[PDB]
Amino acid sequence: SRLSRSGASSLWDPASPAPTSGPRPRLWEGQDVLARWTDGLLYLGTIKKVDSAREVCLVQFEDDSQFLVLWKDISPAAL
């Protein structure tokens, strides 16, 4: 049996005060998101539901499309 999943990301803590330059928005009801689809094209929609347990969220799209998107395929539409 294997114990390690191979590939470690961020395993060190800060020793001195460090400011935040790249902020990351959160998943909430009424959040304009960009749901990336498997066709290579992006999708615009607002958050109708949130699943912070399985890292998922439901969003209502411009063309009345209610599609379930993952927090990894989502890009907050702000800038």
Binding site: L42, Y43, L44, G45, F61, E62, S75, A77
Partner: peptide, 11 residues
């Protein structure tokens, strides 16, 4: 070209 439904980053 489309322009009536979703309006994401560019497409």
């Amino acid at each position: 070209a489309t322009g009536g439904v979703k309006k994401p980053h560019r497409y």
